[PDB]
Amino acid sequence: FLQINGYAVSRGFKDLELDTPSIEKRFAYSFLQQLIRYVDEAHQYILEFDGGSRGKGEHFPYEQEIKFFAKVVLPLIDQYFKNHRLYFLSAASRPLCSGGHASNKEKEMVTSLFCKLGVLVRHRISLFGNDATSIVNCLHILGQTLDARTVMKTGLESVKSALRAFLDNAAEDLEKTMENLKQGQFTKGVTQIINYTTVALLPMLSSLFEHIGQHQFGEDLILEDVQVSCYRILTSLYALGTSKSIYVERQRSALGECLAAFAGAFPVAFLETHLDKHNIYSIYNTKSSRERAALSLPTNVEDVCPNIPSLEKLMEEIVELAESGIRYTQMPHVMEVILPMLCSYMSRWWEHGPENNPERAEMCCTALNSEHMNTLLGNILKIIYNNLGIDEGAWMKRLAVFSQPIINKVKPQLLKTHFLPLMEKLKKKAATVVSEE
């Protein structure tokens, strides 16, 4: 009756303002703000329990807070990130074009939480009541949801320093780990530190390297002193797989996976040092000789990494050991780590090879070709042929999934006359029961 009489009733007060310009508009941003807060309280808590752990009293007044953190903050991060993984991976390509662009502030504070969770998990697995594996999975999903390139190209200097230190601390931890295994060959705090290293430190870095690899982007992440830490990491996790020891035998597979991921993630030719002078994007080329004299850098690529041999030499010992057909239990070094090393190397640098880019002649860094991969995969298949009925295991099982990108890369038309070696090595061993590939 009011309407028909003509009086028009509406809302008492129309909108006065709108909160879209604010970056705390996103409940994700606000929740992550509160989250970083509670984790800062957790950090000062863990400093307090580290002070009291050296003290006699192991009783903690903040046990309720410890349980709250571990049972709420730790799993909620994981579930949120595995549910809205695409939201953080918004890389200006507009994924899910309807919406879901994570802000640069969102990503940078996610990276700060990333780093501070790393700092917390550093050497506290004993304090974690068997939930240390849960923190390991948590930082796995953190690394899978990482978006660090945007925040490093545009971000706050504190976030920059945090993201550097996140891998720096792992760098000196692993380094002193290698000095301690070989100095203390004889059979405690150092044992607990090595347990932390093997259980978490290698897998977290491997997850980060896999993230970098399947984004294919991070040639910007690699920066000054980042190459220094990267060569330290390379030589280190390579010497771990090169040396044989009763301690390292158990964790051989983990370090192999980790360094295989590292080879793919690292975007500068780490094995092609003979013609790396042709590269210009190599940050070791970009820093200039002034920065080489200023920083602790040996000024010569050959002295920087002398332990690792040349690519053609390594592949020719691979060829000759394949021809010899030595058993895997005899010397498992190469079959366990070196073959994934190559597989990741070629898989990453195949599109960078001059065969895919006949342009920029004599500006090509890494030299590789289809026949190179064909010979090396022939070596792999002849090795597995030699070790079919010998000692079996799962190392061939995992190197098969590592070599999957190579068999996708190689043309099936080229892998004619190789179809038969594929069905054979499998059809002939009817007496055996193990199945692979």
Side-chain angles (χ1 to χ4, degrees), residues 196-314:
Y196 165 72
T197 310
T198 53
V199 164
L201 183 63
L202 283 72
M204 316 175 306
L205 294 174
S206 67
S207 59
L208 269 300
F209 302 155
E210 290 178 352
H211 175 274
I212 291 154
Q214 63 84 30
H215 293 58
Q216 294 83 18
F217 182 76
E219 69 273 10
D220 61 77
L221 263 147
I222 180 69
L223 299 175
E224 71 277 17
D225 190 359
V226 179
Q227 296 178 314
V228 177
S229 63
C230 276
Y231 290 42
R232 297 197 281 114
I233 289 176
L234 182 63
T235 53
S236 51
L237 282 72
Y238 182 76
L240 294 174
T242 303
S243 65
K244 65 98 176 180
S245 178
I246 60 170
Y247 293 99
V248 68
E249 287 322 295
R250 183 61 62 87
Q251 295 88 19
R252 290 295 277 219
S253 67
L255 61 84
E257 161 69 60
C258 295
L259 184 61
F262 182 76
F266 182 75
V268 179
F270 64 90
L271 183 63
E272 209 275 328
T273 49
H274 62 280
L275 294 174
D276 61 354
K277 277 76 69 177
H278 294 268
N279 202 357
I280 61 171
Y281 182 76
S282 177
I283 306 299
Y284 182 76
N285 302 3
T286 68
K287 271 186 269 285
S288 75
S289 67
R290 179 69 272 171
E291 204 170 336
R292 289 134 175 94
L295 188 153
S296 67
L297 188 153
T299 78
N300 298 114
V301 58
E302 73 276 15
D303 319 302
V304 178
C305 286
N307 51 324
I308 58 172
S310 178
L311 65 92
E312 71 274 17
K313 187 173 72 175
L314 291 174

Side-chain angles (χ1 to χ4, degrees), residues 11 38 47 49 55 70 128 134 143 146 197 234 237 243 276 333 341 343 374 434:
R11 181 65 181 87
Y38 293 103
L47 295 174
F49 323 120
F128 308 143
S134 63
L146 181 65
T197 310
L234 182 63
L237 282 72
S243 65
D276 61 354
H333 295 87
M341 295 299 102
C343 295
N374 192 0
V434 66

Side-chain angles (χ1 to χ4, degrees), residues 375-409:
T375 55
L376 293 174
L377 63 88
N379 294 148
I380 296 169
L381 63 87
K382 196 266 184 182
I383 280 159
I384 67 170
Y385 184 23
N386 291 139
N387 307 130
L388 285 171
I390 300 301
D391 64 358
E392 279 104 344
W395 49 274
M396 73 291 291
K397 300 182 180 68
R398 59 179 60 89
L399 63 84
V401 70
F402 292 166
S403 76
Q404 183 62 255
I406 297 89
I407 71 169
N408 309 120
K409 275 168 33 164

